[PDB]
Amino acid sequence: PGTVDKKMVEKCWKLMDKVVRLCQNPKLALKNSPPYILDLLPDTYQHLRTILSRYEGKMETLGENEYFRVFMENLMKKTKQTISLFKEGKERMYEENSQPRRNLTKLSLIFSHMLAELKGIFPSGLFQGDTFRITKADAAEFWRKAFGEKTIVPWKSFRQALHEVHPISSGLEAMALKSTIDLTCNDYISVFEFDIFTRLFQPWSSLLRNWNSLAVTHPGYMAFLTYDEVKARLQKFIHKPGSYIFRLSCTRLGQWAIGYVTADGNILQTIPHNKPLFQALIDGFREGFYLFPDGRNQNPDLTG
């Protein structure tokens, strides 16, 4: 990427200013629940200001920052995609359950994720990518050993390097993998993104094999969905006790968010604590809570 100059941010802001208003339209009837775009942007803007306030002068040190170059870039691109969706989605936006509208929810998550990432690679507003505290030991090794201090790497690289320890089946399996990890949708994998994945799919020992069993071949795994969407979706099995689906959490990044239907026909959502998703699923199924992955009558045998 090129250099990120003071002007650059200006544009991104103007773009952010619009994306908001568009989403401020009543017809959309957007709910407060996160992800909640109407906030993620203001907050993002806010943080960017904090950052820019601290590099106040040493602006070149920042524009130079590889990761920061990426973000703004991705961000700018992302604000646009949203703008288009509206004009090239026209009145179809206000149509709940309309492809154009689903894309909107998607981006929401990204924005939420992006913010999460940014605040991580810039706690306090001062860059700290090269020293990011990776959570699981094992993983932390692989990353610092494979990429050293790099804060963000081209998908390509990450793939090759990863394949040495964890073999990637096909060119397709990898495309799937990439979609799961690349939370900021920018063909780059950051130490932050890396951490979140490795946390969700631990143990590192069998990283991809777990992923395979919890997302590649498991009907319950739901890519980019939100709390609302999970409830909205499980509603077709609304009173088919056992029916459940899982996804990534929006507020508690790095953790799971099961969505299930209670014997008394109700939709709840739990975030596994003190027990890996692997375990939650095994027990829940045993106790009659995690029986039908997304309606499906049959359930995966994680015991393998």
Binding site: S33, Q269, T270, G284, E287
Partner: peptide
């Protein structure tokens, strides 16, 4: 804004 959404693991 704030949540409430999440429920305890039935166990």
């Amino acid at each position: 804004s704030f949540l409430q959404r999440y429920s305890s693991d039935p166990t």
